[PDB]
Design a protein around this nucleic acid. Structure first.
Length: 172
DNA sequence: TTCAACTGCTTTCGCATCCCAACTACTTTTCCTCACACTTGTACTCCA
């Protein structure tokens, strides 16, 4: 349930985000050439946005000049399936080089259908399996205001290698 | 018959642009663990 302090990575997750952010670069360019009639591939993505670094989300005052008139002309299904088609053409040949469940992912996440499999569950590393165990027992006693026990879990969690700042300072 | 620059000399011992590095990333090195499609009979009756 609770967040874990692991620097966990797998090839199926390194691909499935890269399989996603490779695609998004093409469909972003395609949206602006139809707006013109009217290469890490993820390092290239975040150059469109400013990472907030103070808050989670870049919140912004509103009663100011950051306002806009509402755009009138809206989407339809006929324009959406023709603006995605040419990015869906070029994507299909790297879709057969990637693994089929990464390929099952991008087929599923492009029609809606967010993933229901959370990444810290199938990792099965036996050391992360205790790091997932301890942090769900760490928060559970802090939830239950049991402090001599949640001390003991927290003293044991910081000694297991690979744990982060996340557990460290927050519940001081 | 004079003005104005070129001129060597003050002491006496001893003191005294190129490289490197940081951290976080991404990647390669491979080795190990199984599945996915194909096929002949046999089984349960099928129509003669």
């Amino acid at each position: 349930m609770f967040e874990v302090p692991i620097t966990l990575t797998n090839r199926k997750f390194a691909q499935r985000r890269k399989l996603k952010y490779q695609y998004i670069n093409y469909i972003s360019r395609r949206f602006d050439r139809i707006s013109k009639k009217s290469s890490d591939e993820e390092r290239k993505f975040w150059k469109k946005y400013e990472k907030p670094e103070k808050s989670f989300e870049i919140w912004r005052t509103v009663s100011s000049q950051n306002k806009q008139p509402i755009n009138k002309q809206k989407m339809t299904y006929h324009n959406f399936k023709k603006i995605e088609k040419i990015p869906l053409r070029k994507m299909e040949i790297p879709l057969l080089h990637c693994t089929k469940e990464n390929k099952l992912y991008f087929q599923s996440i492009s029609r809606g259908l967010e993933p229901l499999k959370t990444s810290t569950s199938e990792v099965r590393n036996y050391r992360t399996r205790h790091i997932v165990t301890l942090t769900d027992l760490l928060h559970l006693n802090v939830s239950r205001h049991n402090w001599s026990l949640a001390y003991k879990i927290f003293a044991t969690l910081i000694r297991i290698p690979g744990v982060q700042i996340k557990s460290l300072w927050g519940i001081g």
